Design a binder for this molecule. Structure first.
Ligand SMILES: O=C(c1ccc(O)cc1)c1cc(Cl)ccc1O
Length: 208
């Protein structure tokens, strides 16, 4: 059972801007996704301080970066709070309508695409390098779901039954053919060191 949804007009507009605007500094997508993972890990950490049972679904708080050259995918995995089906559908827990408006107003006032994260819509920078994005998530209060979108104005949501993840979110980036540099170990290391060197959770770069 696959449900298909239309993006709200402002988000479709944001995604089209990200896909069609000439902007060479695409590497910021990884900083934005690691920042989202760090925010999700802060949330489960904070909840766990008053209710330790919130960590029954996994005590380790970390981020993994998994390149796969054969599948042309870069996966970002975290053991953060995860998202309910309701929050997945509601723009992956973001204030994407108001955030898109504020980002649009900033771009007209001198901002550049790298400042996207300041407006709470950093997730959508995945579309600088991915033709398709799959988001697998598990929140303590709901079941495991898979969100997917190749942009074009719609996304799908389905229950995910293969590979239970305990708790957290997995962002699978199906890379564009000219963006395979982001599967190279030395390139990922360089971007992590440049933009995410002080993230408060261990970041493990997997090898092949
Ligand atoms: O699960 C979350 C999430 C949940 C709540 C939250 O406030 C922030 C991010 C998640 C969302 C994205 Cl899009 C990427 C990584 C993630 O860890």
């Amino acid at each position: 059972e696959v449900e298909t949804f239309a993006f709200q007009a402002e988000i479709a507009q944001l995604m089209s801007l990200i896909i069609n605007t000439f902007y060479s500094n695409k590497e910021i997508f990884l900083r934005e996704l690691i920042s989202n993972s760090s925010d999700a890990l802060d949330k489960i950490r904070y909840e766990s301080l008053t209710d330790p049972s919130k960590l029954d679904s996994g005590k380790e708080l970390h981020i993994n970066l998994i390149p796969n050259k054969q599948d042309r995918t870069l996966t970002i995995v975290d053991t953060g709070i995860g998202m309910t089906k309701a929050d997945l559908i509601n723009n992956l827990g973001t204030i994407a309508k108001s955030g898109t408006k504020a980002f649009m107003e900033a771009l007209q006032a001198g901002a550049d695409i790298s400042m996207i994260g300041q407006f709470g819509v950093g997730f959508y920078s995945a579309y600088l390098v991915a033709e398709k994005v799959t988001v697998i998530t598990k929140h303590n209060d709901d079941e495991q779901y898979a969100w997917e979108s190749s942009a074009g104005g719609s996304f799908t949501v389905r229950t995910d039954t293969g590979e239970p993840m305990g708790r957290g979110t997995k962002v699978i980036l199906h890379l564009k053919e000219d963006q395979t540099e982001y599967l190279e170990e030395r390139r990922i290391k360089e971007i992590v060191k440049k933009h995410s060197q002080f993230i408060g959770y261990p970041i493990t770069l997997f090898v092949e």
